Amino acid sequence: SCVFVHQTLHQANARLAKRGGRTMAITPRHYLDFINHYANLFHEKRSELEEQQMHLNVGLRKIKETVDQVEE
Amino acid sequence: AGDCLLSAAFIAYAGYFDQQMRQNLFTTWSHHLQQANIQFRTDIARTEYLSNADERLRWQASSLPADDLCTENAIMLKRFNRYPLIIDPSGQATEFIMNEYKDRKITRTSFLDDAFRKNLESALRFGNPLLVQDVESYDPVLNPVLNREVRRTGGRVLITLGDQDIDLSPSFVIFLSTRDPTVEFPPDLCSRVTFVNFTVTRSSLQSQCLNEVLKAERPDVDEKRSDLLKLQGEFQLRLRQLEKSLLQALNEVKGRILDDDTIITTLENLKREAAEVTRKVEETDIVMQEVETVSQQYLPLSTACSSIYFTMESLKQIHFLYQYSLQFFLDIYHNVLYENPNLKGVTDHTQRLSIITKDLFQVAFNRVARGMLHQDHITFAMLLARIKLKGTVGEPTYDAEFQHFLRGNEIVLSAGSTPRIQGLTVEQAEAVVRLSCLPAFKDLIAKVQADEQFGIWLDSSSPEQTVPYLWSEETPATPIGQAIHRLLLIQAFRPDRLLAMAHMFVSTNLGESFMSIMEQPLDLTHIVGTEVKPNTPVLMCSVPGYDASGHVEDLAAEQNTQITSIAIGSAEGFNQADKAINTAVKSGRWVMLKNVHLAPGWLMQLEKKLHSLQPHACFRLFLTMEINPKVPVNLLRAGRIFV
Question: In Å, how far is A41's CA from the nearest CA of chain B?
Fold first, then answer.
């Protein structure tokens, strides 16, 4: 999918050039920047969401503990 | 995973393309992800995924335009790997950056400035955000820092600049900006830096004006629209923090083996808060006719605003003196929505929209025409009339009629094509046979032959007032349709009355008193009192053989304001003008510059100085000038024109 994203950016640049509008070259440095941004965003969002998920799972284990409490 | 992929793809790419191209790229990526079943959430928006409420509110306080393109640009500006290159023909990005980074005491610098290197090394040493307003004359000393060539020697981060080594600070960020949106860059530049386009396209200004009218007019129902903004705001925050407080009280390892645990009832409040968030989402579903309707009722208004402003830009083609910027049209918009006496006693909302659009057209014309030659007033009036005709939904679009009215002369005829109609000249006969090509004018020649009142009407002083009925249409026509048909008839028949009949057509379109302000002399006292900023100078561009000093002198005397009048003749005039303006910036008195057309470069320098200066509210700078092309375009764009 990432490769396809780069290829469609190249195709869009070519189409814009054919139409006659102003276009700027897309370098593989752009692909490197895209991959780096993907890594950073994935890390940050995964960290936050999974911290909340771990809190929720600890809460669920405590819910099972309360189930055992009502059991005895 | 898929959402982050799309977010990063939009962040790294799509930084130069306009709104339509960005949407096309996003749609293509989303379609491809759907084909491969990479699960990506669709209800969320790119402007919301990467932004926080506090950051968005700070941007709003930092004067960020409400356009979603500008929000995306701010998002890209916040998070980046390569230093951005901002393209802001409007000029809003520079002020947005300055307000956003005012806390970090960002310093302005120009490439043309010789102290650029000193400012750069000062920024690296201290770690200050730096902005360069012009990069077209690129200086390649930034190639190492753009490449981030960093050498980690000891505990030092060291940068090699020219033949010198400078320590780097992590807090240092360099911002590159270009005023020209039409400049081309070498491939190394686009390889090394990322683009943040701020060009105000039709969609961009359309959305900006839509959001502005939503906020300004309809304000408590702007909060009804912002029910969507608050559904996940101060609303869902209570839900989430209530859940976390319930977790805090869930097992405090206290009261073990106790049948008393009412804390469960707080989950009822949790359910109520979650239901509040979900039902406000269902209010956003009711936006199938709630907020989409609050938007589409003003959609004609915003479309007319975009058309008006792009007519205002493209007006520079017909004359070099017709230079208008975004800020001028935005001041027009604010003066229409705010400080408008016409809506003081008006509360009905549809009628408020109607009077708002009427006053928008009126104020736009009355502000543009003041700096427009009298021979061109009818041109802009007709342009606004066409815009309003397109905007209103009841009338036909009239593309064929206007197209013929503008391009009749390009139609080629023949000697035999003219039937030599009695009572009509050869050119008149060519006009008749040419305009008969229209389906509504196919039987026109028969009407020429049959009619007998043609002789008096054709030779009358004002045929446009009593144009006879010749065009044949199966159904009764609108008054606007009759007006345009008679306009075509006048153009083909008595072209000498074309201007007068154009006046009548504009009157029928935009009201009989649309030009009634023009006949009266300029109310200089009101224009210089309000509606003009002290920073913006007043340009009085008079044609040869006329001076504007008398009117401004009368204005100053009647306002009992001490005004210093100096002439631009030599370096002594330059020094006197500089001293007078420097005194008047702080004192607040008026200062006049006479015949400023003599020094174009000094005028450019004065414009640059005026931009940096902070005039007092009472400060007013009048620049009486001759209308010659030597005057820099930037001053005309940065000042109010009065011909």
Answer: 6
